[PDB]
Write an enzyme that holds these catalytic residues in place. Structure first.
Site, PDB file in Angstrom:
ATOM      1  N   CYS B 164       0.806  -1.207   0.000  1.00 40.02           N
ATOM      2  CA  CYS B 164       0.000   0.000   0.000  1.00 40.02           C
ATOM      3  C   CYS B 164       0.848   1.271   0.000  1.00 40.02           C
ATOM      4  CB  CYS B 164      -0.874   0.138   1.250  1.00 40.02           C
ATOM      5  SG  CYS B 164      -2.198  -1.062   1.322  1.00 40.02           S
ATOM      6  N   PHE B 215     -10.750  -3.110   1.427  1.00 38.45           N
ATOM      7  CA  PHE B 215      -9.987  -3.092   0.150  1.00 38.45           C
ATOM      8  C   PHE B 215     -10.977  -2.953  -1.011  1.00 38.45           C
ATOM      9  CE2 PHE B 215      -6.438  -5.762   2.256  1.00 38.45           C
ATOM     10  CZ  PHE B 215      -5.617  -4.670   2.443  1.00 38.45           C
ATOM     11  N   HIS B 302      -2.176   7.954   2.560  1.00 41.22           N
ATOM     12  CA  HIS B 302      -2.788   6.678   2.189  1.00 41.22           C
ATOM     13  C   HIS B 302      -3.826   6.299   3.243  1.00 41.22           C
ATOM     14  CE1 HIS B 302      -3.553   2.800   0.617  1.00 41.22           C
ATOM     15  NE2 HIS B 302      -3.270   2.269   1.842  1.00 41.22           N
ATOM     16  N   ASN B 335      -9.973   1.476   0.219  1.00 37.46           N
ATOM     17  CA  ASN B 335      -8.500   1.347   0.182  1.00 37.46           C
ATOM     18  C   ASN B 335      -8.118   0.623  -1.119  1.00 37.46           C
ATOM     19  OD1 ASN B 335      -5.867   0.568   0.433  1.00 37.46           O
ATOM     20  ND2 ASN B 335      -6.010   0.020   2.620  1.00 37.46           N
TER      21      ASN B 335
HETATM   22  O1  LIG Z   1      -3.645  -9.020   0.699  1.00 33.81           O
HETATM   23  C1  LIG Z   1      -3.604  -7.825   0.335  1.00 33.81           C
HETATM   24  C2  LIG Z   1      -4.512  -7.270  -0.744  1.00 33.81           C
HETATM   25  C3  LIG Z   1      -3.864  -6.134  -1.529  1.00 33.81           C
HETATM   26  C4  LIG Z   1      -4.808  -5.455  -2.480  1.00 33.81           C
HETATM   27  C5  LIG Z   1      -5.548  -4.346  -2.084  1.00 33.81           C
HETATM   28  C6  LIG Z   1      -6.426  -3.715  -2.950  1.00 33.81           C
HETATM   29  C7  LIG Z   1      -6.577  -4.210  -4.234  1.00 33.81           C
HETATM   30  O2  LIG Z   1      -7.429  -3.598  -5.106  1.00 33.81           O
HETATM   31  C8  LIG Z   1      -5.847  -5.317  -4.645  1.00 33.81           C
HETATM   32  C9  LIG Z   1      -4.970  -5.933  -3.771  1.00 33.81           C
HETATM   33  O3  LIG Z   1      -3.336  -5.109  -0.643  1.00 33.81           O
HETATM   34  C10 LIG Z   1      -2.612  -5.556   0.436  1.00 33.81           C
HETATM   35  C11 LIG Z   1      -1.784  -4.621   1.015  1.00 33.81           C
HETATM   36  C12 LIG Z   1      -1.032  -4.981   2.122  1.00 33.81           C
HETATM   37  O4  LIG Z   1      -0.233  -4.015   2.660  1.00 33.81           O
HETATM   38  C13 LIG Z   1      -1.098  -6.270   2.652  1.00 33.81           C
HETATM   39  C14 LIG Z   1      -1.924  -7.200   2.068  1.00 33.81           C
HETATM   40  O5  LIG Z   1      -1.986  -8.451   2.597  1.00 33.81           O
HETATM   41  C15 LIG Z   1      -2.715  -6.861   0.941  1.00 33.81           C
END
Ligand SMILES: O=C1C[C@@H](c2ccc(O)cc2)Oc2cc(O)cc(O)c21
Ligand SMILES: O=C1C[C@@H](c2ccc(O)cc2)Oc2cc(O)cc(O)c21
Lengths: 389, 388
Positions: B164, B215, B302, B335
């Protein structure tokens, strides 16, 4: 006095070309002799009954021009992990459990050697590029390496996952811009590749998967890149100019899919022919602005995807047989270690140049070229300048 | 005689990296948060978990999300029941979706960025593609190059399994590509699809369940370049960047790509660790600029979840206006991992235009963009607005 963005920019940038200041390499300890590999491989995969397929694999090994490869995987680990010995048993979880640990560990071994050569404090490392085709995780191998080495927590990281064989070129193309655009920047570059993701049993249906079992080896390489070398630093090579291109009519020539059975390798078309057909265009783009048209007057680093690429490039351009020596040496002693190979080859050329008392780190020549070849079909070009010895 | 020093002087750009376009795209399936607990517990055949559904409703009600866009719909989930299981082997089904859908959504965002920029796409020299949703070889960067018809010689940076914080990471990278290369024009695409992380509920892993409430899917694209032409229209300048690992944050956010897909693990107090460390990040970024009033800059953070925003606001004493653009994207999109800060940069420019403010940064000159993610990693980008 009010600070402006233009002021900051002028104070922030480096002056000179990106310079390779150290190279270190590492391999897993299990050395695997190519001459006995067909017997070992057909035995551990319970495939001894497939006598015709074993003959085809012996010819692949005999033609490979590989003497040995280093492999994390050994008989003990394969016995503990029979899903990895099948052709297509569910096995990704077993392969991830291996490579999420072993990729950064082997990286650290190469990085410690690069840092030792460089001779500066590791606190002066400002940027980290970590490149692998073996596994993925969050946080990544870049984070794991940062902790294993005790780098500053504020190191700027570039995590390059699932890149494939051209990425030894990509990491030098990236490191060039990081070093040149940032006064004081010192870039640690690590490529670390472990065939535990791709090892699997043989079948007649997929002879392209079988070629992989003959060629791919394990290894890691690390370089230190920076602009404006201190007097106490020791330049090896300058990074002059870079390109990346997709070859025409190459769609699907090399595909790799990460699946529940691990990483699967797929081949179409004629990779050596496509690269040979297109290599001169890539060389003209690199060298015509430098006034160079004799490709025997430059030092060569070429990704040894297999011996056929090197033979057909040599024949197409009429290279003297000595030009590919460093490249063929690495292929012979280590196999195709994907992104790391071209960095092993750079080390081997420096080492041979020292041993034989040549005038420069580039076999006594001033200008050189490095080529990465991989999925796309992608060609990475890096123009290099040697340093005097 | 051509020297490396002469090549270097001719090859490099003069001015700061400049954002010249922002475009965004989402999948068409809009999912209302107010009804999501009923929808989710029905399509996962979990209606019998009545105590868990009540916990999930409270998570959805506290999320401060009104809606999300999802590639996944009821038809796709009925076709792929291994994806609806809490933990069933399902990665091949997930990969089959995201290896196509990620570059497709990225193309939709990129076409809009290129339209705003108003230049020929043959002038794009570099492509950064960023996702946390699937991997393949060749990568989504190759697929997007083919879909858009960029030059075969475009220089590509394929940023997989990033998480992220990587909205900050792609700007930190674009900055150096644009600034070191005369004429360079960088296309940046972040594209995220939750088909990789969607899964059925259990009471053993309430952290996996939090993911299902927060998400969403989306893609965003920017054009970055130094030395703008008179016919290009700057939006923001990229001034300074940093990445850091927070102390005492080991294991705070882990994500593992397994046979069951991408799994999300939480330890420690993410909002607390970010809030505890955010002033040190601001001081490093802004004390060289002579700025110490964090209410005097524009903010992009974020929106990992609402607790992160609430605790940073309370720790620093941000006025309630500062997090408005950030909260607006969390409300309308959830998110979207790496893409979320680029949606927020777009939202801030759009509201600045709508309200007749003097700059793309809500009438302010200087701004900060933060990415937060696994590490615990914080990315910091200092921004300068442009006059409207
Ligand atoms: O397992 C996931 C899903 C991923 C995700 C989010 C939004 C999207 O549209 C697609 C994928 O984001 C993440 C972000 C993280 O820091 C840790 C995580 O475990 C994950
Ligand atoms: O399937 C693989 C294996 C991988 C690899 C090689 C060496 C190593 O040590 C680890 C992984 O390299 C590849 C490179 C490709 O371009 C395409 C591929 O399909 C693969």
């Amino acid at each position: 006095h009010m600070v402006s963005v233009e002021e900051i920019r002028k104070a922030q940038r480096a002056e000179g070309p990106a310079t390779v200041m150290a190279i270190g390499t590492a391999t897993p300890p299990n050395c695997v002799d190519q001459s006995t590999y067909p017997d070992y491989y057909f035995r551990i995969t319970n495939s001894e009954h497939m006598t015709e397929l074993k003959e085809k694999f012996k010819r692949m090994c005999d033609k490979s021009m590989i003497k040995k490869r280093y492999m994390y995987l050994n008989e003990e680990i394969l016995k503990e992990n029979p899903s990895v010995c099948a052709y297509m048993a569910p096995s990704l979880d077993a392969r991830q459990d291996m490579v999420v640990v072993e990729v950064p560990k082997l990286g650290k071994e190469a990085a410690t050697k690069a840092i030792k050569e460089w001779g500066q404090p590791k606190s002066k490392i400002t940027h980290l590029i970590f490149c692998t085709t073996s596994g993925v995780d969050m946080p990544g191998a870049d984070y794991q390496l940062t902790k294993l080495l005790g780098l500053r927590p504020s190191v700027k990281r570039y995590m390059m996952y699932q890149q494939g064989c051209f990425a030894g070129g990509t990491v030098l193309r990236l490191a060039k811009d990081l070093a040149e655009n940032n006064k004081g920047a010192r870039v640690l570059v690590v490529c670390s590749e472990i065939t535990a993701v791709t090892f699997r049993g043989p079948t007649d249906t997929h002879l392209d998967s079988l070629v992989g079992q003959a060629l791919f080896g394990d290894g890691a390489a690390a370089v230190i890149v920076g602009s404006d070398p201190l007097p106490v630093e020791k330049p090896l090579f300058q990074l002059v100019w870079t390109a990346q291109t997709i070859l025409p009519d190459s769609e699907g020539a090399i595909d790799g899919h990460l699946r529940e059975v691990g990483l699967t390798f797929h081949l179409l078309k004629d990779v050596p022919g496509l690269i040979s057909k297109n290599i001169e265009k890539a060389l003209v783009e690199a060298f015509q602005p430098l006034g160079i048209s004799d490709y025997n007057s430059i030092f060569w680093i070429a990704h040894p995807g297999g011996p056929a690429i090197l033979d057909q490039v040599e024949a197409k351009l009429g290279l003297k047989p000595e030009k590919m020596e460093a490249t063929r040496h690495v292929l012979s002693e280590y196999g195709n270690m994907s992104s790391a190979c071209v960095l092993f080859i750079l080390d081997q050329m420096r080492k041979k140049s020292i041993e034989n008392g040549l005038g420069t780190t580039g076999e006594g020549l001033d200008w050189g070229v490095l080529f990465g070849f991989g999925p796309g079909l992608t060609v990475e070009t890096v123009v290099l300048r040697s340093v005097t010895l």
